[PDB]
Design goal:
Order of helices and strands of chain A: HH
PDB class: protein transport
Largest sheet of chain A: none
Organism of A, B: Nostoc sp. (strain PCC 7120 / SAG 25.82 / UTEX 2576)
Structural class of chain A: mainly alpha
Entry title: Cryo-EM structure of the contractile injection system base plate from Anabaena PCC7120
Number of strands of chain A: 0
Chains A, B: All3314 protein
Oligomer: part of a larger assembly
Largest interface: A-B, 7 and 6 residues
Helix content of chain A: 55-70%
Strand content of chain A: under 5%
Keywords: contractile tail, injection system, macromolecular machine, protein transport
Protein backbone atom coordinates (compact mmCIF):
# COMPACT_ATOMS: atom_id res chain seq x y z
CA UNK A 1 0.00 0.00 0.00
CA UNK A 2 3.10 2.18 -0.26
CA UNK A 3 2.09 3.14 -3.81
CA UNK A 4 -0.26 5.77 -2.37
CA UNK A 5 2.88 7.85 -1.80
CA UNK A 6 4.22 6.88 -5.23
CA UNK A 7 1.04 7.62 -7.18
CA UNK A 8 0.99 11.03 -5.51
CA UNK A 9 4.50 12.34 -6.13
CA UNK A 10 5.75 12.58 -2.58
CA UNK A 11 8.81 10.67 -3.86
CA UNK A 12 9.67 12.77 -6.92
CA UNK A 13 9.69 16.14 -5.19
CA UNK A 14 12.51 15.14 -2.85
CA UNK A 15 14.62 13.77 -5.70
CA UNK A 16 14.14 16.99 -7.68
CA UNK A 17 15.12 19.04 -4.62
CA UNK A 18 18.24 16.92 -4.15
CA UNK A 19 19.18 17.17 -7.82
CA UNK A 20 18.89 20.94 -7.87
CA UNK A 21 20.98 21.26 -4.71
CA UNK A 22 23.70 19.05 -6.19
CA UNK B 1 12.85 -0.61 -12.24
CA UNK B 2 9.81 1.64 -11.86
CA UNK B 3 11.08 2.93 -8.51
CA UNK B 4 14.23 4.31 -10.17
CA UNK B 5 12.66 6.44 -12.91
CA UNK B 6 11.27 9.90 -12.13
CA UNK B 7 7.98 10.90 -13.77
CA UNK B 8 8.23 14.39 -12.23
CA UNK B 9 11.33 15.81 -13.91
CA UNK B 10 10.33 14.64 -17.39
CA UNK B 11 6.98 16.43 -17.18
CA UNK B 12 8.71 19.57 -15.91
CA UNK B 13 11.27 19.35 -18.71
CA UNK B 14 8.65 19.02 -21.45
CA UNK B 15 6.82 21.98 -19.92
CA UNK B 16 9.97 24.10 -20.10
CA UNK B 17 10.56 22.85 -23.66
CA UNK B 18 7.19 24.12 -24.83
CA UNK B 19 7.26 27.37 -22.86
CA UNK B 20 10.60 28.31 -24.41
CA UNK B 21 9.65 27.16 -27.92
CA UNK B 22 6.60 29.45 -27.85
Amino acid sequence: AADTLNYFELKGLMTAYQQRLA
